[PDB]
Amino acid sequence: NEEFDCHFLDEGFTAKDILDQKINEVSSSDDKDAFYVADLGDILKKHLRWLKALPRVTPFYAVKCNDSKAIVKTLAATGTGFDCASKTEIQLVQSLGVPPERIIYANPCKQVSQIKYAANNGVQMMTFDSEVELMKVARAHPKAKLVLRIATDDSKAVCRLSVKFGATLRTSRLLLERAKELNIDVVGVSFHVGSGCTDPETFVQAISDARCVFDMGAEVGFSMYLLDIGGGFPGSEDVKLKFEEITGVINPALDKYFPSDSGVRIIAEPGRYYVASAFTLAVNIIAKKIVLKEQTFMYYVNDGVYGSFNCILYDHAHVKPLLQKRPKPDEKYYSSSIWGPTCDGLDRIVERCDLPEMHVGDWMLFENMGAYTVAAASTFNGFQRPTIYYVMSGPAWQLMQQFQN
Amino acid sequence: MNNFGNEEFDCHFLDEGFTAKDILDQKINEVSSSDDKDAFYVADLGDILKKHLRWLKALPRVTPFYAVKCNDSKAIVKTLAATGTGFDCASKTEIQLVQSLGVPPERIIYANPCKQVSQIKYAANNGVQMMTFDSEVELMKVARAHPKAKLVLRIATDLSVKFGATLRTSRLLLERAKELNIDVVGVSFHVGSGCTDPETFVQAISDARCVFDMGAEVGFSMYLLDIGGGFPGSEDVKLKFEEITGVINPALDKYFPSDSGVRIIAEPGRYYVASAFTLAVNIIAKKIVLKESEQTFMYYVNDGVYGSFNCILYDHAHVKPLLQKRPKPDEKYYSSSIWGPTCDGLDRIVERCDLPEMHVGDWMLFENMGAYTVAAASTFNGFQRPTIYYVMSGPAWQLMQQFQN
Ligand SMILES: Cc1ncc(COP(=O)(O)O)c(CNOC[C@@H]2CCNC2)c1O
Ligand SMILES: Cc1ncc(COP(=O)(O)O)c(CNOC[C@@H]2CCNC2)c1O
What we know:
EC number (chain B): 4.1.1.17
Enzyme class (chain B): lyase
Distance between the termini of chain A: 27 Å
Strand content of chain A: 15-25%
Radius of gyration of chain A: 23 Å
CATH superfamily of the largest domain in chain A: Alanine racemase
Cofactor (chain B): pyridoxal 5'-phosphate
GO molecular function, one term (chain B): ornithine decarboxylase activity
Bound molecules: a molecule of 2 linked components (A1AQO-PLP)
Oligomer: homodimer
Number of helices of chain A: 12
Organism (chain B): Homo sapiens (Human)
Order of helices and strands of chain A: EHEHEHEHEHEHEHEHEHEHEEHEEEEEH
Structural class of chain A: alpha/beta
């Protein structure tokens, strides 16, 4: 099918050039639906970069970030783990041939029937942060390996008084004693610093806290070996806090609190890092209005906040439109807004930006659209999700085969 | 109650003396001793038939065209088509859905002011003649891909930011349409969903009259007046349907008398379906928080802001959780929050409310969940859309048959 359909990327060509080619090919066809170009070679590059930056940390891809079957198949061929939050994601991962020991059910609040499904399919490792979860596990998957998820405080997060997941150290101690009472095996500690991390020092704090809980486990009789540092790493270079800074702050903390001789196994749950920059979205300007204030423009394109751009609300992502052909400096720029296809007035992509005068049929490009865009899109107003074209060069395929070897 | 075959076309009998609430009670009791407690809807089509009867009684001069985007369930569209209402379609997929159920094109209005060219072409190919517009570029596109269309000018009202032409712009649009030999047959407006002041309608109607007169000056024979939607779909509102209709009908008689030959239609979306759907979610997780001991609770249920409750973010909807059994007056209440199945922290249905202490396996009910809830739901994190159980009483079926004749 199209999902499993992969196109060759010839030598000297990038995803950008492929985008330009397809756009030129449909110049006078009049079928100008929005579409993605997904470079799996970018995912292989990200994996190489991860192996180089965090050699002690095994990556478990957060499927909920992008559940595309091609992505999961490529990552499974690469040999990464997978973080699954629901029965459907476990089904997806196992359907591609991944054994259960490469799957972590890292949802702290799981429905009982889904816990039973995880037990039925041999997924042993699950996270938890509450006593009711311990009761449910004892009653539905008693031989599970539990990872205690501890809380982290993020200043940039809107809500800090109420945190959905994560136990405090005080609560963690009681959770460990309760797990010992119920004869449930606790094997490690997990945390999630959050995508909007501004200061890498936070990770260190979390790591320190994790060590503390590890010691607590040693006091209660548990053999703790699994440390899960979660996700939140950036997926593109268009950020102030870059991946390598975070890793350079993390590695000394890991060496200090969890030395290799201790026998600890360190993992992570990066979602956006692997896929963010792999996808580039092309939308077509389907409508245009001119408002006199000085000329300003309202452009309507064929994707919106109910589709790929739901990240504007759910993830609060900031999107900047890109022109296919670069404009000369002398050309005048105008104040413009960009709107979605749906009738709702709340379907606005960009409130105000500077753009040259464009016309219906012109294309706009959005880079770094791999993370939390298609995974949360809906078909409101009947508009279908854009076709995704997967590309991969021969050298990239060779690297993937080497990983299999 | 269990669906057999296809859920979309499966309808269950509602016995005499039974309401949707009783069906909810029965379904909840049926799964009392099992762990498959997925969230589900009960949809009373008889409530939709009641809404249609109420509309016919309140707005005898206004033909309703159901806004398919509010709820695209095939059962809903089938019932309304059997009832003989029109349909407002915003995209190619909605036209496909409506025509697949046997609705002729003259009962379809393409009320999307900014349509992609290929979708205009599709509408032309399938005989849908009537389309809305509010811009000159739209006139160019129509003259190119649908020359014999009947255009309805959408005017601004005090959604207005995204759509709606001013009277000044309306004059130029009518003259430009005359230049391009495009037939303009009427005027449409949308006062907005959940309008606080009914007087707006009067103003809008007045404005419509003006544009009608403009058409008479340029040579158009204007006959179609479209007053849009925005009518409430439940009694749980300050401004009730009958007040709005009591304000609308005199304005229609004053500005568009029946002897003038005008044909008046509307595009009610939420009015027909809002109260017809009741949602049942199961409490899948529970946390107890101590305030320094004042006990507060966090309940995690199996639907969230990525699912049915996306209306909180998109539709500005306030949800009221309801208990299956009415609580005792002396029963103690606690401060509580309600959270979704997904790992995302922002997936919170209710920040704070007063509820008695509940336990995993208990059910919560949400009424008036028919409008803009399932139509914009996604499968983020792999969580599946709730099963919908359609019910209909015998007398409701008799009323539907009377409408069909
Ligand atoms: C438990 C857990 N592990 C990993 C991730 C992935 O985070 P990343 O930033 O690496 O993609 C998550 C996801 N956390 O938040 C996802 C939010 C949903 C919309 N965008 C942010 C979790 O929870
Ligand atoms: C053009 C048009 N006609 C009808 C409707 C339906 O409005 P109603 O309030 O009767 O359901 C609409 C609605 N448009 O957007 C609805 C937004 C989506 C989420 N809540 C607001 C339009 O546009």
